[PDB]
Amino acid sequence: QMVRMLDILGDYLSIKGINFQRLDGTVPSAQRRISIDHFNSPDSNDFVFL
DNA sequence: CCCTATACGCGGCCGCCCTGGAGAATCCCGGTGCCGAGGCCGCTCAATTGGTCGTAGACAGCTCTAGCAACCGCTTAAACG
Numbered sequence: 001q002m003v004r005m006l007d008i009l010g011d012y013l014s015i016k017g018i019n020f021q022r023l024d025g026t027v028p029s030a031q032r033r034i035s036i037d038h039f040n041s042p043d044s045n046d047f048v049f050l
Numbered sequence: 051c052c053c054t055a056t057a058c059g060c061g062g063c064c065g066c067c068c069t070g071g072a073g074a075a076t077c078c079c080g081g082t083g084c085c086g087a088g089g090c091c092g093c094t095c096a097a098t099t100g101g102t103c104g105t106a107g108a109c110a111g112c113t114c115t116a117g118c119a120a121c122c123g124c125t126t127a128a129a130c131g
Contacts, residue, residue, distance in 0.1 A: 001120080001121075004120090
C-alpha cells in the first residue's frame with residue numbers, strides 16, 4: 001500500500017543481490033512499459049516484481 | 051751735644067661672621083551640635099474571616115462535518131538551467 005515499504009523491500013533486494021523490478025505512482029508510463037516488457041520477456045533474469 | 055724731621059708699631063674705635071632662647075604656625079584629641087535614617091505611636095479604612103446562596107463551567111451523551119496521512123492519476127503552467 002505504501003511506496004516507502006516498496007523502497008524498503010527494493011533496498012533489501014538490491015543489497016541482497018536479486019534482480020528486482022518496481023512499479024509505483026512516481027514511475028512514468030514509459031518506464032512502466034519498459035519494466036513490464038522486461039519482466040514478461042522469455043529471457044528475463046528478473047525474479048521479483050514490486 | 052741738643053734740636054728736629056722721620057719711619058715704624060699699635061691703643062682705641064668701627065664693622066663683620068657664628069650660634070642660642072623665645073615665640074608663632076600646625077596636627078591631634080575630646081566635647082558638642084546638626085542631618086539622614088531608623089524605630090514607635092496614633093488614626094483608620096480596606097483586606098480578612100465567616101457564612102450563605104446562585105450559577106459557570108466541567109462532565110457526559112449524541113450527531114454531523116472538517117481535517118489528515120498516505121497513496122493514485124491527468125493536465126499544464128510555472129520554475130529552473
